[PDB]
Every structure is written in C-alpha cells, then in structure tokens.
Design a protein that fits this description.
The structure is cut from a larger assembly and holds 6 copies of chain A. Chain A has 5 helices and no strands. Chain A is mainly α. Chains C and D meet through α1, α3, α4, α5 and α6 of C and α2, α3 and α4 of D. Chain A: One of its GO terms (cellular component) is T=4 icosahedral viral capsid. Chain A: Belongs to the orthohepadnavirus core antigen family.
C-alpha cells in the first residue's frame, strides 16, 4: 500500500532523505519560488511535462494543511508538528520538483551523489565548499 | 497560488462541483480502488500518463492528512468528523476524476459529466430513467 | 415593439407553452449549467454563436431581477412577492435559459424537431397517450 | 456566475464606467428609438449580426421590469418606483444604448465614440469645451 | 544626472511647458483610466512598444507616493497632503497623461495635440474660442 | 492595477526578494552608474532598448522622491523619516535601479540566469553552503 511518490523520477525517498533535515529551505521560501519562477507554466492549461504535474498537487496540499492548521489551531504543540514530521517530508517535494525543471532532472539526480560524499565526510577534512547546481 | 488542478485535464473545479456532494464515492472505497487497478502501474518506475502521475501525487497527500488527523486525534467532534465536512469532499473528486480517467479516457470522463450533468438537474418525469455509466 | 424572443431561432413564444411547468429544471439548478460546461463560450472575446449572444444576455437579466428581488426583501404579503419571480414571470425566463443552452449540446435543428414531437405528446390528452416521456438526444 | 455584459463586443464593463449616469437618455426614448429605427430588423426571422440579436433580449428583459414594477406597485411604493429608474438596474438603460450604435454605425465607431468621451469627461471644466463628440454619421 | 523625461518620445520637457497646471485631470482618474484602457496591455508579459513600457514605471512610482504620504501622514500634516497634490511632483500627473495617448492614438498624434494647444493657450481670450482641440480618434 | 515592474522582463517582484539587503550597492554609489557609462543611451533621441525605457524613468522617480525628501527636512522624529526613504521604500527602488543597469552590460538573458543561481545560494541556509559568492559575469 506504501506507494512511492518518487519512483517516476529516479530517486527514492531515501535518495531524498539522503540529505539532512534543516538543509532544505522553508516552505514560505519555496512556495514563493515556484509562483515567482514558474508562474505561467503552472497556470497554463497544458501538461507540458510529467514533471510539472506532480509539482501542482503539492501546492493544493500546503493550502490544504493551512485549511487544517488554522481551523483546528483556532478552536503550542500542533505548530511544532507542522514543521518537523509531516511538514519536513512535505517540504522535500518543493525543492526536488522545482530543481529538476531548474537545471535538469538528471542534474538533480547527479546533485545528490556528490553531496553525500561531501556531507557524510565529517568536519575534519570536509572540503570548504559544497556542490551546488550551477548556471 | 491560483493553481486549480484541472486546467491540464480538461475540467475545472467548477466543472466537478456541478455534481451533488453525496454522489461521490467514499474515500476508503477508493483507497481499495486505487489499490485495485494500478498496483504494478503506480509503483512502476515508468510514469504512465499525466493522469497517472497525479494520483501518485494524490495518495501521498491523502496519507499525509490522515496521518496528522489521527496524530492530533491521540493527544488532545474535533478532528475526523470535522475534517471530513468542508475539504474532505474535494479529495474524493480529486481521486475519482483520476482513477476513472485512464480506465476509459479523459474524453469519456468529461462527456460523462455532460451527460450525467444534464440527467440529474432535469426532473425525473422527463429524463432517461437510468443514468449513463462508464462503458468503454 | 411586439418582439418575441424566438422569431429568429425557429421557435415562437407560443411554441414553448406546450412545455408544461414541471418540464424545466429548477432555476438555481439550471443557472449553473452555463457555469457547468459553457464557461469558455460565455467568456470568449469572440462570440461562438448567435446562440451565445442571447445566452450571454440570459444571465444578465437574472443578475438584475434577483438583484431587485434581494432588494425587495430588505425594504418592502412579501411571502408571495419573491416567489412570484419564481412562479410566472420567471417561467417565461426559465424557458429563455434552457433553450439557448439546449442548442449547443444538441443543435438548434435538433431542439426544434424535439419540441414538435414533444408537443403532440402533450397535445394529446392523458386518456390515450404513452406515459414514457420523449427524452432529448441526437 | 461572473459573466461581463461585454466581453464579445469590443468594450469591457470597466470601459462603460467612463459614462456618467446623467448622460444616458430616458429608457422610454430608446424603445421608441429602436422601434422607429429597427422595426424591420427585430421582427425579422433572421439575424445578420449579433449586435441586433441582443437588442431583442433587452426588450424582452425590459418588458418584465415594466411588468414587475407595475405588479409590485399595484398589489403591494415610490421608493420602488424611484428604484427602477435609478437602481443598480440602470444596466438596461446601459445595455440598450450600446447596441443601437453598433448596428447603426458599426461596432468600430462605438469604440470611436467612447474613448474620445473619456478624455472629454475627465478634463476639468476650466478647459472642457461644450462640444462633446456626438457620433459621426 | 540631467536626464530629461522626454528625449525619446518626440516632445521635450520645454514643450510640455505649454500646458498649464489646471489642464491635467486628477491623478486618481488616470489610474482608473489606464486600468480600464490597458489592463491587458500592462499585465502582459511582453512589450509591443516603449510607450506602454514606461506606463507601469509611473504606476510603480505612484504607488510609493501613495505609500509615503500615508506613511508620513499617519506616523508624524495637510501641508504635505497639499504638497503631494500640487508639488513639484505634478510630474507624475504629467508623466501619466503623455503615455496614454501615445499608445491609444499613436506617438504622432500626441505632438498633433500639443502644438495646436500652444497656439490656443497663448492667444488672448478676446479672440480665443472655447473650442480647444481635444484629441482626434 | 496590480502591476509588477518586471512582468515583461522575465522577473517578478518576488524574484528579487531572494536578493538580500546588503547585496545591492548604495544608492548614491549606484545612481551615478547610469551617469557612468550609460550617458549616451539615456540621452539619445531614440531609445536604445526597452530597458532604457524604464531606466530613463528610473532616475525620474529618484529626481522626485529625494526632491520630496529634501523638502521634508525643511518643513516637517525626522531622524527616521528621511532614512526610511533609504530603508524600505527605497529597497524596492534600489532593485529597480540595478536590474535595468544589469542588463546592458550583461544581457537580460544573463541576469535572469544569474538570479536563478543566486537564489539557491541563499535559499540554502548557512549550515551547509559555499561562502564564495556567485559573481556576475558572462
């Protein structure tokens, strides 16, 4: 029953939980990114790639969690849960789905492998720069 | 922001709000239905269709909501009979428009809503005595 | 002056009196049919038809009569006043809402042939007539 | 059911907000105008253009307003009478005026009537000459 | 940083000194004009001409003036309020009016509007007929 | 109405919020950049670009806001008033000054690709990110 959300795009959840927790940018920083960058691509009535569609259904859900966040939190422990346990795994989608349209789906799948050998190296002789998706 | 989930799939949220809210099948039936017809299709690494990848980014979201709902249900009328009132209606039709789509074709599903749409508002003294169904 | 709303489109004002009062769907049940599957052809910058001329002016009246009728219950025996909008003046207006919507799903050649056949099923009294209603199709 | 009255015919409903509510003639004048101008072009069993197709729909939707205000005025008062003249339903005074010139002077010149008016109606009366452009013929 | 507002578009800033400061309409009218005229031609993701390219830059530079005068008026008064209407910053009332007619009537006819006005505005009122040339359509 | 100053030129108002407050040069340090090497393309009788449309109207605002702000210190707690022009309302306005100047030295195709790459360097928190700043070049 556990349906992989990521098997369409090379990675798995543990190619995606491969990275640490707070390394992913915040949802307010990311939901304001796709509306900034890919505004006309999302509003368009054409499915212009299969990679665009899975980015769309997440944007309903963060609006759907806020339909559950405020409307339950109005009637100091729920707010801590929306950022850490379901929220962090929900925060994964926005970085991974935007970036494969940023610089390439195969680019982001190659982004992870160099990142782990950078970051699972302990701070004794970790190189000073991190690999970043470049121009 | 203003991203409705149907501009790429022919309908609107207005087009699916034409049906009465009770007509949609209940969610735990569709969980088996989504588990029925696409076991080796949803897990398969080939993305089948844009209709197919959206259900896979629907069952992950519906699992996240009831994750919190039972989680907040075990620490505090309040939750499950509460969340299934105002926004628990649309995640039925988010699923049902997708699970029924590529079983018969998107044009089959949209013309179904035309024919079943005109069938339900006309009074029963003059409509066809049955509703149409999914044929082919 | 004496201008019937159907003289161009092959009907008359008298042709729709064969249609009984319970044939048509309810107004609020029918007003969203233009909102159902006619959203493009009502809001395209080009008219898709002469039918979408009048149908675009169909809702334009209902956006004023009920706007008046909402104003009635604020400032005006009022139990019959707002219901009369739904009773007799609207019964002509419900005919206006259905017929233009009836075209684009079926064809105006279809609906004009439909009301001829529907007429004889209700011109004929219920002493000897088939109770199965003639449905609308191709 | 947000359908603008004019998405099909050039102007938009924001564009008719240039016109003040003191510019339009009385509604009984335009019916007598449209009867005198296009008696043959409204009882006609055919349309040549959509511009005099919607004209009968306003006439069909003005007759019920005369029907209702007389019905609600002789069965119920001057507030409703002073309503129907200068209500939110000045729209039918608006709707009748726009479709007269589109048939009589083309859809093109009606937009050539209004934009010139918007410059003339907003410019202050210190330099605003009493020679407002009435329509070319 | 002496950049004239108009070296690119025909007229010069000395040429707009013909126009008196009582001729221009109120600034709230032109925003409602430009929204009604060119809602589609300002939210557009492309430019067809530079004349409605600078129109959004005035709208971007009028919103801060509404922002600042409200901010400096609700945190500090009527002198600053009577400033921003008839200050040295009537320039944004000037800048908005010039770019409306260039898109709506061509860059050519805007110069065909102003030179005729300069003859009419300087000729004394003994022979100065109240029929000042409003724009051709 | 709601008109962002970048909808044509491939950016948004939200895209520049990734740029921090200390990225941009100081206003008086940047206002002469148009006076530096753009004197011809600001004062040519023909516009050299759609970029020099807005950039010619860039200084036109700063010739009025500071003209207002100079008038503030004459006739108007005034320690914060003129500084607020340099603090928050100007921070949008400093973005307007740099971006059009950013084009003609580099290309608008260059700068739009620049802010995408600059965004991820500041979307990423300083727990794990390279401290060498991505400079602007070809």
């Amino acid at each position: 029953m556990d349906i992989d959300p990521y098997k369409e795009f090379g990675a798995t959840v543990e190619l995606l939980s491969f990275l640490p927790s707070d390394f992913f940018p915040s949802v307010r920083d990311l939901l304001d990114t796709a509306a900034a960058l890919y505004r006309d691509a999302l509003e368009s009535p054409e499915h212009c790639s299969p990679h665009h569609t899975a980015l769309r259904q997440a944007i309903l859900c963060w609006g759907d969690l806020m339909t559950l966040a405020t409307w339950v939190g109005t009637n100091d422990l729920v707010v801590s849960y929306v950022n850490t346990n379901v929220g962090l795994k929900f925060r994964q989608l926005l970085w991974f789905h935007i970036s494969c349209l940023t610089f390439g789906r195969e680019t982001v799948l190659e982004y992870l492998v160099s990142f782990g050998v950078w970051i699972r190296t302990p701070p004794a002789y970790r190189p000073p720069n991190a690999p970043i998706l470049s121009t």
